[PDB]
Design an enzyme around this catalytic site. Structure first.
Site, PDB file in Angstrom:
ATOM      1  N   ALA F  66       0.831  -1.183   0.000  1.00 48.51           N
ATOM      2  CA  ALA F  66       0.000   0.000   0.000  1.00 48.51           C
ATOM      3  C   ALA F  66       0.885   1.258   0.000  1.00 48.51           C
ATOM      4  O   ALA F  66       1.961   1.239   0.576  1.00 48.51           O
ATOM      5  CB  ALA F  66      -0.902  -0.051   1.205  1.00 48.51           C
ATOM      6  N   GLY F 111      -1.561  -4.838   2.758  1.00 49.33           N
ATOM      7  CA  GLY F 111      -2.869  -4.674   2.170  1.00 49.33           C
ATOM      8  C   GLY F 111      -3.195  -5.742   1.152  1.00 49.33           C
ATOM      9  O   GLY F 111      -4.345  -6.152   1.044  1.00 49.33           O
ATOM     10  N   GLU F 114      -4.112  -8.783   2.758  1.00 52.16           N
ATOM     11  CA  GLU F 114      -5.333  -8.566   3.473  1.00 52.16           C
ATOM     12  C   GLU F 114      -6.537  -8.687   2.528  1.00 52.16           C
ATOM     13  O   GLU F 114      -7.524  -9.364   2.867  1.00 52.16           O
ATOM     14  CB  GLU F 114      -5.284  -7.219   4.203  1.00 52.16           C
ATOM     15  CG  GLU F 114      -4.443  -7.283   5.482  1.00 52.16           C
ATOM     16  CD  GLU F 114      -4.054  -5.915   6.018  1.00 52.16           C
ATOM     17  OE1 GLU F 114      -3.529  -5.105   5.233  1.00 52.16           O
ATOM     18  OE2 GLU F 114      -4.266  -5.626   7.227  1.00 52.16           O
ATOM     19  N   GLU F 134       3.952  -4.906   8.058  1.00 55.89           N
ATOM     20  CA  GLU F 134       3.539  -3.626   8.613  1.00 55.89           C
ATOM     21  C   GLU F 134       4.334  -3.237   9.868  1.00 55.89           C
ATOM     22  O   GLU F 134       4.548  -2.076  10.140  1.00 55.89           O
ATOM     23  CB  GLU F 134       2.039  -3.641   8.912  1.00 55.89           C
ATOM     24  CG  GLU F 134       1.179  -3.448   7.675  1.00 55.89           C
ATOM     25  CD  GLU F 134       0.806  -4.729   6.947  1.00 55.89           C
ATOM     26  OE1 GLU F 134      -0.073  -4.607   6.058  1.00 55.89           O
ATOM     27  OE2 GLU F 134       1.352  -5.823   7.249  1.00 55.89           O
TER      28      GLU F 134
END
Lengths: 254, 254, 254, 254, 254, 254
Positions: F66, F111, F114, F134
């Protein structure tokens, strides 16, 4: 989007949403549900709005019900979708990160009871009526009623109201805790504005986060609920309003 | 089965179930539990029963506790089992697809309080009392008391009652929401029947599915609960009663 | 550890714990929470103690809030840690295997409301006030407020109290179930002690196991809750108390 | 009750339940579901049975499916009841207080997959097939499949098997953890009897209570789950088998 | 407190905790649990410690069970208390706000399996064995076994392991996900330390908040779980680490 | 809306959604999230779409993280919000009444991991990798990672990955159940389409209701879950496809 059946007004830090189908006693329908979804958006798009008041047009009805013509022909799979959509909008209302107060100025039946139950706080005029007539129409409550009523007034009363489909007056709504306060019609809006202004005189992120902590922590076991709170409590100490208010509190010696 | 401690009757579409042991103030015992199991079964199978009133014979007593002689000699593994069998009967009553009204006409203590709590709706005569004395007898509530009272009246009152073992009166039962209404002893069955008949006058699939939704959705987070509702709502649109009641209502509404 | 914010006394089988910062209105700060945890742990090991009464000192305050000086300069990560530590102390009190009665003798705000909500039974004097000022200070409740209030008084009222931050008198508090009783100052401790004393006369293992079943069963679905109960109920049949109370009860009542 | 489609055999401490509709490849139906409910009863009525083995007649099918002729004409409300009843029997199997092992000797499709998933442990012959074809027949799984499969092999695989309605072989059932072990057909029953005899060589109340603790604690948050365990753990120290076995363990020095 | 069952060492930012009862196969008894709680509390206050490795001593055992001498004569109420105290120690480890890695260097049975399941990450040496002997001794698992195993390896396998009480080798253990890796004895601590070391290089507030979100979110429904995450995610934006790692990352990667 | 970062197509009754940013290895950003929201919306409204394949353009990447530039300057309250908006999109995808297949063709990180986890089914090409970096960036997973990975692969692996921030390969993704299958890069879309088509060949109401049941029932206790199933099962009997598929099957079965 054009607004036939609903009125959004903003002033100061409070919005007033007014259901306004004066002919059909403020009943819900496809269109009025879409319009409510849209205004929920407007309201969440505006960070200067800190509290909402939901009410009905006129002196007789808050929200009378939903339109049955719309529902009569649906099949199983259509009704199911119609249930999901209304629930979507009311759930959105419930989670909206500003407090919403329901100013229940008269009949709150069916979907009207259900949408009031979707607010954070309910107050009623003395003329207000509450009920769920759905089971006399061959259906369950369809916009959460089978869930928010028991959570709000206990299983015993919820079951009675839902299985009998009989209405109750404002005073009784107060006895079972469905509304927080009952006042005279001419006092309804002032009382909602006073509660709204108290709320809005408070620090918005704390109210915002407190609402989330209550909404979410209520769904789970107490240990994960309490952890949820401390995470949100932490977030508050990152704001101006936290330091300023605790500071000015300690201007107590003056 | 020929019943000695339970009387089962049908007036209209309502089953009236009466616990009757005049020697023992209608106290539960094993036999009485097995008879109750049997009649809940009969009521399950009877498509002509749309609502149930549960009551006690006489003027003094609803159900006054449970036979202590049966229990005194039990070891840990036998007590466990005994608690499981009782709870089963009561759960089964709780889940019955016909609504159940406890018409509490006298003492409802221990097991008696518990069976009453396992009904959907509790109504009481003004001489009624409720309590859980189990903790004076060296035991916890064993027929769901530690679970149902809490849920119905809150943790504060439940904990007070179960810990002190002290009875409350009907006016207090009403105040804390344990019962929906209190009326004179000679108005009790009438009010129960009036409730039961209003239920029975409604669309039965709708009542049945509203009860499921309420029972089941109350166990889980609001989002899944609301989703359960919509599946049940949709099923209603497979029925004539829905088509018919709505048509009727649109026409009559005028 | 030696204590100078909290007194601890033992009267036969009941311990009275009194928060004693007269000039600070019995407010909570880190040293106080720390001492509370110590006394809780002290009551934990004392099997002569079978119930607890918590109160404040003097006639103005139960506990008036928490020290805002310790908090004003905290940041996000420290805020969070504070929240967890308070909650950890209050949760230990809630789970404590003896019943605990809050004798709310006066002001009970913010952390003080939260500590009282963390006991089994609340009882108040007609002078008491309850509230959650936190959002006026740019914070959410930090010691369980967002979770315990709504669980005790329902969502409608908890949300109003927390979003507005306004206080309520002991009479409102009883109305919404926050407390189980209101008495006058002069009656408070006698009332607490007579509640404590009844509790203490009952079988100790039964009250203990009841507290646990109510706390733990309340977190989960009704079926696993009910099954929890029976396991506890079974355990009571391992005690002598169960054997003697039920032998006594038979002969006694005759 | 007469037993056409199911065989219960008892010997030693293990029961073998054999589905036996050799023509319809051991498919389930109204009658075969009632017969299974009845045998579950017999089995729970007998405390000398400590472990069960569920299998299918012959060398080709464990349980192929359910009878579709029976289902084709049902309406919404009938199918719903038909779902509740099968689920009732399988849930009863799952909770039965003896371990049940599924000896999956061939096709386990639809209701057959679902009934195997209702056992405590699954082992398969190398010829066994598993799947849920229901969605190709215009329905969901109806006997729990929408719930036990994801819980047993994760959401990813459950969803694929259920949305595609495609079968998988024994080796793949093992890779995703749906069965614990795969063996040759001529070894199936010996392997189930060996696991069954290991289980039954253990202390029955501990197995009994361990089963309950796993079944129930799995439904809730970890703190209430762990409390559930200690209650059950307590109960064990009230038994002969606990003292004798810990004693004879310490005959270790010999 | 001074320690003679448990060694504690600090290597830069990682603490190694080694249970050291070589002659007892590192078995758990009350003094050991007590010391564990102390060292856990010790690691809790040491902010230079950002990860933990737990292992046993020597080359035969991780932790081989718990002392059956302390247990043999316990009764129902004392059994229960033991269970709670163990679980309380293990739960504190599970929630500990630094990550903890079990380096399972050998035997891991009963309480030893349970302690390993109470860490964040398990890793084993090819000699390790896992199991739950408890039911052979007339007890259920007492330190979380009935809850943690099924959560980690699924119900099929947990039930087989607990009902049979038979052990499995490190290769079976990896297959069912009980462990994340198998290495040879000589590689174990290097493997642990390199896992610990990567963890320690990452942002500390982020790993902390991740551990909490995974633990607490896992207990509840996906919607309130997801919302928990965002509150924690938000908190990361209050740290300098977030600002510097993301400034670095941009320029760095270019 | 004209789409710049997302390609939406329809082949048969399957929607193919492709994330395409060749400058950024298909990394998410705000714009891309809003486009994805829009297309999930389009797919909701399109009764001609019965299944979805989600993929990434190119040979290197599915979705590689991201945009960090958008995030670096955010405060706590903005990060919170950003985590909420992303999660919303992904939840919405998770709940879509058409099944969704992630065809993971390359890097799926942060992301990217995810969004893939938010699909119903994950299939991967042999060069694919999965990870959550992250925590090296000073943040937790913020688009549901702390919640979904755990649920899909267990707590052990999830905690290892999120804490170390290290990528795994496809063979390992498969081993831990993160994906159902792994195939050569040039077989990936073919296998996805083969899955999607088999789904689409099935009764769509049944697929739709199976997905709801699975999504929703997995959130709650088994008893309420099983009850949800039966309401959904019943709704299917309101459909022609059920009547028709069963008739067809009985006739063809012969």
């Amino acid at each position: 989007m054009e607004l036939n059946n609903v009125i959004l007004e903003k002033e100061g830090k409070v919005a007033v949403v007014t259901i306004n189908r004066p002919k059909a006693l403020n009943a819900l329908n496809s269109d009025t549900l879409k319009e409510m979804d849209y205004v929920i958006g407007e309201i969440e798009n505006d960070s200067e709005v800190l509290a909402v008041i939901l009410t009905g047009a006129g002196e007789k009805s808050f929200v009378a019900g939903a339109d049955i013509s719309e529902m009569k022909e649906m099949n199983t799979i259509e009704g199911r979708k119609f249930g999901i959509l209304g629930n979507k909008v009311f759930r959105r209302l419930e989670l909206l990160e500003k407090p919403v107060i329901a100013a229940v100025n008269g009949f709150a039946l069916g979907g009207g009871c259900e949408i009031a139950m979707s607010c954070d706080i309910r107050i009623a005029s003395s003329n207000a009526r509450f009920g769920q007539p759905e089971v006399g129409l061959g259906i369950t409550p369809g916009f959460g009623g089978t869930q928010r009523l028991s959570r709000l007034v206990g299983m015993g009363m919820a079951k009675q109201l839902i299985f009998t489909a009989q209405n109750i007056k404002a005073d009784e709504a107060l006895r079972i805790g469905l509304v927080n306060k009952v006042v005279e019609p001419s006092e309804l809006m002032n009382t909602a504005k006073e509660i709204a202004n108290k709320i809005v005189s408070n620090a918005p992120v704390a109210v915002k986060l407190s609402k989330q902590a209550i909404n979410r922590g209520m769904q789970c076991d107490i240990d994960t609920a309490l952890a949820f709170e401390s995470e949100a409590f932490g977030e508050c100490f990152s704001t101006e309003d936290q330091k300023d208010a605790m500071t000015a509190f300690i201007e107590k010696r003056k």
